[PDB]
Write an enzyme that holds these catalytic residues in place. Structure first.
Site, PDB file in Angstrom:
ATOM      1  N   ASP A 153      48.295  26.003 -10.006  1.00 55.53           N
ATOM      2  CA  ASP A 153      47.339  26.751 -10.459  1.00 55.53           C
ATOM      3  C   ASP A 153      45.705  26.148  -9.234  1.00 55.53           C
ATOM      4  OD1 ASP A 153      46.264  24.368 -11.551  1.00 55.53           O
ATOM      5  OD2 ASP A 153      45.600  25.138 -13.350  1.00 55.53           O
ATOM      6  N   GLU A 165      41.695  15.855 -18.440  1.00 60.66           N
ATOM      7  CA  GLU A 165      41.722  15.767 -17.028  1.00 60.66           C
ATOM      8  C   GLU A 165      40.778  15.645 -16.266  1.00 60.66           C
ATOM      9  OE1 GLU A 165      40.938  21.039 -17.264  1.00 60.66           O
ATOM     10  OE2 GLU A 165      42.658  20.032 -16.140  1.00 60.66           O
ATOM     11  N   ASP A 223      44.116  18.323 -11.568  1.00 63.64           N
ATOM     12  CA  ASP A 223      42.593  18.173 -11.817  1.00 63.64           C
ATOM     13  C   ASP A 223      42.231  16.911 -11.865  1.00 63.64           C
ATOM     14  OD1 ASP A 223      40.657  20.421 -11.709  1.00 63.64           O
ATOM     15  OD2 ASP A 223      41.923  21.472 -13.375  1.00 63.64           O
ATOM     16  N   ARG A 225      42.829  29.949 -23.150  1.00 61.38           N
ATOM     17  CA  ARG A 225      42.132  28.794 -22.446  1.00 61.38           C
ATOM     18  C   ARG A 225      40.891  29.534 -21.605  1.00 61.38           C
ATOM     19  NH1 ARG A 225      44.491  24.597 -17.745  1.00 61.38           N
ATOM     20  NH2 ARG A 225      44.914  26.624 -16.706  1.00 61.38           N
TER      21      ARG A 225
HETATM   22  N1  LIG Z   1      50.310  22.602 -11.753  1.00 55.74           N
HETATM   23  C1  LIG Z   1      50.137  23.698 -12.352  1.00 55.74           C
HETATM   24  C2  LIG Z   1      49.759  24.822 -13.263  1.00 55.74           C
HETATM   25  C3  LIG Z   1      50.276  26.085 -12.823  1.00 55.74           C
HETATM   26  C4  LIG Z   1      49.845  27.254 -13.733  1.00 55.74           C
HETATM   27 CL1  LIG Z   1      50.272  28.987 -13.390  1.00 55.74          CL
HETATM   28  C5  LIG Z   1      49.127  26.831 -14.993  1.00 55.74           C
HETATM   29  C6  LIG Z   1      48.585  25.429 -15.246  1.00 55.74           C
HETATM   30  C7  LIG Z   1      49.111  24.719 -14.434  1.00 55.74           C
HETATM   31  O1  LIG Z   1      48.444  23.260 -14.813  1.00 55.74           O
HETATM   32 MG   LIG Z   2      43.299  22.013 -14.925  1.00 55.61          MG
END
Ligand SMILES: N#Cc1cc(Cl)ccc1O
Ligand SMILES: [Mg+2]
Ligand SMILES: N#Cc1cc(Cl)ccc1O
Ligand SMILES: N#Cc1cc(Cl)ccc1O
Ligand SMILES: N#Cc1cc(Cl)ccc1O
Length: 719
Positions: free
Chosen positions: A625, A426, A454, A331
């Site tokens: 994240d 997203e 997001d 990514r």
């Molecule tokens: N929510 C969430 C999330 C966590 C990690 Cl570590 C990676 C991608 C994600 O969407």
């Molecule tokens: Mg995202």
């Protein structure tokens, strides 16, 4: 400066050296030709990259004014909808079509299963995720709360036999449910043999083969008394380890030691929201890990290596091999940020997404072979490179990414369309123009997906001026998001994704709540998703159970041609109704969001960690994240904007939650507390800035502030 001049570019020496010494050799790409290609691609594509970001701002300003010049209580959807069309936000829907993407590996076109997302900057985690394609069901069951600690199966420092026995029973029922015997149950199996291309299972009374002998896939050791029996169901493999010698096998009625599930079929190696990388040194660490993975020599020190392939004997005789590793995507970052890894003559930083395409694409060449100079491991057997592209807004931005990949293939000397794209859905302007976005990438697309964080952040920011939004928890069940989930599946299937490309759904964040995951996450394949995101190898194994229970191919066939979401549904703004909240409910939500921000920002800014098990306000461990910052900061900015809460409320919440977060980080020897000297903590100040300056950030993006604060920290630490 410690920089190298190449045309109009001034490249950080650490990156220049990495690429020349480590990335380039073995690729047959001429080093000076590569760098000239970098200079030329950056110079050619930067203006349009800039123009696209300008278009976002221009659209948002128009939407902002539109909401402000409106005093007619509930919004007129007909008016709003034509307004969006007028400004080019809502583009016409193209005629129906099918994707032409070719050269795609079997894990993507065909197999439905779990998908891992892992921070590429952490070598150990990258390695585990890659090795997570095969995982122990016994480990997963025994070690998590899927098996309750009742009657009396409590975990402890030593092996609990009562618990092990429930682990065994659970697995036996899974076998019965997945690969049914013609008669009887695996629970009463006493042994396995292979006789005449067929699996023979011993019961006390009689003997039986499978209800569908086709599910027999292979075996190891003697057909006589195999060391293991390989089953297949819904495309996914199951391996019964037969070994009466083991401590578990000693207790088993058939000598079974473990059940091994093919789990993480694909894995996304992440340079975006799960990592913290704000300069050349950070980018090089990531690129280097991505390199070791593609060469197949990445090795991490505890006291550690990529797994080799697995060897079996086919039912009818003959040896064959199955991949031991998850098929790797990478990514890249999206179109927004620049990074100082390269600057131009005027000192301007170079677009990071453009750089990622060049360097991760270059490095991925290694994963298309195996050698002395290249390392002994392969990623794509069909010759493809798989890049997930996050945070795109609409089909022009998708076309721009495709053009970027085409120019990169040219520099690298790769066939056109080698670099395949996964389109993350997203952002709202992608959601409502999704068919157009897929078409823009019709010859490259191998993946679309949805997710909570997001997309909700963008939802809030887009309609910021419309009014106060509902609470973050309420957002998960709002009409816009349920229509968003279904509309994503509808679009992919209509584009012919079934049998060709992944349709993904979002991350299960509650890392310790595995009973809950197993109970509820089945909804995703039931909704026609061929993949979904899991927070760990253990979760991948457990989530794999769902793909055995659910026939995703069949589900996808049944949904064909359905139009389950209207554009009106997609555009339903999550405005709170009048007087929706008690004062203590408001306080709870503010504390919630301030804690989310503080808990994540403190590890990011201080330790460069972008993913970890972070205890939430109620001490539930969550694996989120960076997008957690975007939703949380935008919601608070929105409540601030519409006078739901005061500046005093926000500050007081921040000061309340800070000691809490400090307390939640007690185990960490390297941790620096935010309390009680709040104004001296760069991390605390970052958290405050994300909220108070939230409404002003482009599409609510947190990177500009977060990166700045992390660079501030690194600098302070250096002196
Ligand atoms: N929510 C969430 C999330 C966590 C990690 Cl570590 C990676 C991608 C994600 O969407
Ligand atoms: Mg995202
Ligand atoms: N932030 C930001 C930004 C950057 C460019 Cl180059 C253009 C428009 C923007 O909003
Ligand atoms: N302890 C323990 C244990 C037990 C099973 Cl059945 C599987 C994995 C383990 O680590
Ligand atoms: N393994 C692993 C792993 C680690 C983090 Cl921090 C996040 C996601 C993962 O799958």
């Amino acid at each position: 400066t410690d920089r190298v001049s190449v045309g109009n570019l001034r490249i950080a020496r650490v990156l220049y050296d990495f690429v020349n010494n480590e990335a380039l050799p073995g690729t047959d790409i001429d080093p000076d030709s590569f760098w000239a290609g970098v200079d030329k691609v950056v110079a050619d594509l930067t203006p349009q990259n800039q123009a696209l970001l300008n278009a976002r701002d221009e659209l948002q300003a128009q939407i902002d004014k539109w909401h402000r010049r409106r005093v007619i209580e509930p919004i007129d959807m007909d008016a709003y909808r034509q307004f969006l069309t007028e400004i080019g936000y809502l583009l016409p829907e193209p005629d129906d079509f099918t994707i032409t993407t070719s050269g795609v590996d079997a894990e993507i076109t065909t197999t439905a299963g779990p998908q891992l997302v892992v921070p590429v900057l952490n070598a150990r985690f990258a390695l585990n995720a890659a090795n997570a394609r095969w995982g122990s069901l016994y480990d997963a069951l025994y070690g998590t709360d899927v098996i309750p600690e009742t009657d009396g199966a409590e975990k402890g420092p030593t092996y609990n036999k009562v618990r092990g026995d429930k682990v065994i029973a659970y697995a036996r029922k899974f076998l019965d449910d997945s690969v049914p015997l013609s008669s009887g149950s695996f629970g009463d199996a006493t042994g396995f043999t292979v006789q005449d291309g067929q699996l023979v299972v011993a019961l006390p009374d009689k003997s039986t083969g499978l209800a569908n002998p086709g599910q027999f896939a292979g075996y190891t050791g003697a057909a006589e008394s195999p060391t293991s029996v390989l089953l297949i169901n819904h495309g996914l493999h199951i391996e019964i380890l037969i070994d009466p010698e083991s401590q578990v096998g000693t207790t088993d009625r058939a000598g079974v030691k473990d059940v091994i599930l093919e789990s993480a079929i694909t894995t996304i190696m992440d340079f975006e929201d799960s990592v913290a990388a704000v300069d050349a040194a950070d980018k090089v660490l990531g690129y280097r890990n991505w390199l070791g993975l593609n060469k197949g020599d990445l090795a991490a020190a505890v006291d550690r290596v990529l797994n080799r392939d697995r060897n079996y004997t086919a039912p009818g005789g003959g040896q064959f091999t199955l991949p031991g590793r998850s098929l790797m995507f990478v990514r890249n970052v999206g179109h927004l940020m620049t990074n100082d890894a390269i600057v131009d003559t005027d000192g301007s930083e170079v677009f990071e997404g453009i750089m990622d395409a060049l360097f991760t694409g270059l490095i991925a060449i290694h994963g298309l072979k195996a050698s002395d100079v290249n390392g002994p491991l392969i990623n794509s057997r069909t010759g493809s490179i798989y890049i997930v592209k996050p945070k795109m807004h609409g089909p022009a931005e998708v076309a721009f990414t495709c053009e970027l990949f085409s120019r990169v293939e040219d520099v690298l000397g790769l066939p056109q369309n080698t670099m395949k794209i996964g389109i993350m859905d997203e952002e709202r302007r992608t959601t409502v123009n999704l068919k157009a976005c897929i078409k823009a990438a019709a010859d490259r697309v191998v993946f679309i997906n949805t997710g909570f964080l997001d997309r909700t952040g963008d939802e809030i920011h887009t309609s910021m001026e419309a009014g106060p939004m509902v609470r973050k928890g309420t957002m998960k069940s709002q009409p816009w998001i349920l229509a968003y989930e279904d509309h994503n599946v509808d679009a992919g299937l209509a584009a012919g994704f079934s049998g060709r490309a992944q349709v993904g759904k979002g991350m299960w964040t509650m890392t310790e709540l595995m009973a809950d995951m197993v109970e509820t996450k089945i909804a995703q394949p039931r909704a026609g998703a061929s993949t979904a995101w899991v927070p760990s190898p253990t979760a991948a194994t457990l989530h794999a159970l769902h793909y055995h229970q659910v026939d995703v191919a069949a589900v996808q066939q049944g949904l064909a041609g359905k139009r389950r979401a209207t554009i009106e549904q997609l555009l339903t703004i999550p405005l709170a109704k009048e007087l929706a909240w008690a004062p203590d409910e408001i306080r709870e939500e503010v504390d919630n969001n301030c804690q989310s921000i503080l808990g994540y920002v403190v590890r990011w800014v201080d330790q460069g960690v972008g993913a970890s098990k972070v205890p939430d306000i109620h001490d539930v461990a969550l694996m989120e994240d960076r997008a957690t910052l975007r939703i949380s900061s935008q919601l608070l900015a929105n409540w601030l904007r519409h006078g739901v809460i005061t500046s005093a409320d926000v500050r007081a919440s921040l000061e309340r939650m800070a000691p809490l977060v400090d307390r939640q980080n007690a185990g960490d020897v390297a941790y620096r507390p935010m309390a009680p000297n709040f104004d001296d903590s760069i991390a605390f100040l970052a958290a405050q800035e994300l909220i108070l300056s939230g409404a002003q950030q482009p599409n609510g993006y947190t990177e500009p502030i977060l990166h700045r604060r992390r660079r501030e920290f690194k600098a302070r630490a250096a002196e």
